[PDB]
A paper describes a structure:
Profilin is also an important allergen present in pollen grains, food plants, and rubber tree, and it is considered a pan-allergen, because it is present in all eukaryotic cells and is therefore involved in allergic cross-reactions. Here we isolated the monomeric and dimeric species of the recombinant profilin allergens rHev b 8 and rZea m 12 and obtained their crystallographic 3D structures.
The rHev b 8 and rZea m 12 crystals (5 mg/mL) were obtained using the conditions described in the materials and methods section. These crystals diffracted to resolutions of 1.9 and 2.2 Å, respectively, and belonged to the P43212 space group. The sequence alignment shows that the principal differences are between residues 37ANFPQFKSEEITGIMSDFH55for rHev b 8 and 37ENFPELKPEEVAGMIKDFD55 for rZea m 12. These residues are structurally located in a region exposed to the solvent, mainly in the loop that connects β-strand 2 and α-helix 2, but some also belong to α-helix 2. In general, the most important structural differences between rHev b 8 and rZea m 12 are the contributions of some side-chains that alter the surface charge, essentially at the loop that has been considered important for antibody recognition 262728 and it is exposed on the surface of the dimer structure.
Author numbering: 0 to 131
Write the structure that this text describes.
Amino acid sequence: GMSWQAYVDDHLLCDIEGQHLSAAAIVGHDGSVWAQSENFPELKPEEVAGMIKDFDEPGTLAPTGLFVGGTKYMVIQGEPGVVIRGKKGTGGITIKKTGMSLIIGIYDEPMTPGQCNMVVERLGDYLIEQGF
């Protein structure tokens, strides 16, 4: 049967157009990690709360910055209540909200934001349809 580690390893860290995410995780809304990749940062307190806040009231994170594992990302265009996106240098991050989790993918060049978006958001949609 399926496991959260399997979803990370086989559905987030998988090859897309010859490129792979640098790291990924699936985390409960309450910050409890369901599964994560080897290099995925440990989350600092209130990082997850920021994301939840930003999903609930769109725009709040932008003046502040997006923090993940003590790394700061410039907020870029997301989708209100559904996806948060950020840039840092030639890399970035996508965070997609499901009914009870957050799907997080982190990429760096030569991976494109579109590729990261695609992988994280498509798994998100699948998980949402399953009730998660």
